Amino acid sequence: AESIAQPTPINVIFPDPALANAVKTATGKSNVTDAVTQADLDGIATLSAFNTGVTTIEGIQYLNNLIGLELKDNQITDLTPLKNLTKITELELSGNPLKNVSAIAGLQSIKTLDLTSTQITDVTPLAGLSNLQVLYLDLNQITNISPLAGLTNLQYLSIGNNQVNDLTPLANLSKLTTLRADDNKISDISPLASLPNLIEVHLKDNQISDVSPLANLSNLFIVTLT
Incomplete structure (x- = not known):
């Protein structure tokens, strides 16, 4: 566990x-110039600063018991302060210019991860996130899904607006109920035949000829194509 040396503003x-403004609210303080103890920081379970111009998350390392972090539509470039957080289950980083997500590879506790529009090309750091249930990877330039193959707890996977051409890495994700994959380079959907719990499959603006692998999926509410 990480800890401030004394009471600090x-x-x-x-x-x-x-x-700073978000921690002020979460700790019940009057002003961002007010002091907090480490105990005040240890009592922050969730922190939200959606669309407020955050450029650095320095200080987050002290939030030992942080469970949910909502940082959508900020301008964060460095995730290093998250590295050693051990209880984060919900991480929302949508819209941030991340470029890579190397810094989250150790965050094994993560159940819900939103990396929509993060300018990433590569999801290799996610392979160790074995507790991941909900993953958003939309609006990036991702090609290879190989690193997701071991993410056997995944229920919801969103990979729309990428450059994905191979769904073979999804073959063992047997808990998946939603696959959203509009606007990719998918032509073979044979892998989806071993995903029996699929309810919603979005496959618009792909290059699909053969929908036979869907014929036996019995929980399917909708498949979309163009």
Whole structure:
């Protein structure tokens, strides 16, 4: 567990004013210049700073018991302060210019991960996130899904607006109920025949000729194509 040395002002620990403002609210303090103890930081379960101009998450390392982090539509480039967090289950980083997600590979506790529009090309760091249930990878430039093959707890996978051409890595994800994959380079959907719990399959703007692998899936509410 990580710990501040003494009582420190919130805007020293969290140099980003937007994130400072969110910790001020989460700790019940009056001003970002007010002091917090490590106990105040250890009582933050969830932190939300959606669309507030956050550019750095320095200070987050002290939030030992953080469970949910909602940081959609900010301008965060460095995820290093998250590295050693051990209880985060919900991480929402949609819209941030991440470029890669190497820094999250150790976050084994993550159940829900949103990496929509993060300018990523590669999901190799996700292979160790064995507890992942909900994954959004939409609006990136991802080609290879091989690193997801061991993510056997996945129920919801969204990979729309990428450059994916092979669904073979999805063959063992037997808990999947939703696959959203509009606007990719998919032509063979044979892998989906071994996914019996599929309810919703979105496959618009792909290059699919043969829908036989869907014929035996008995829980299917909708498949979409163009």
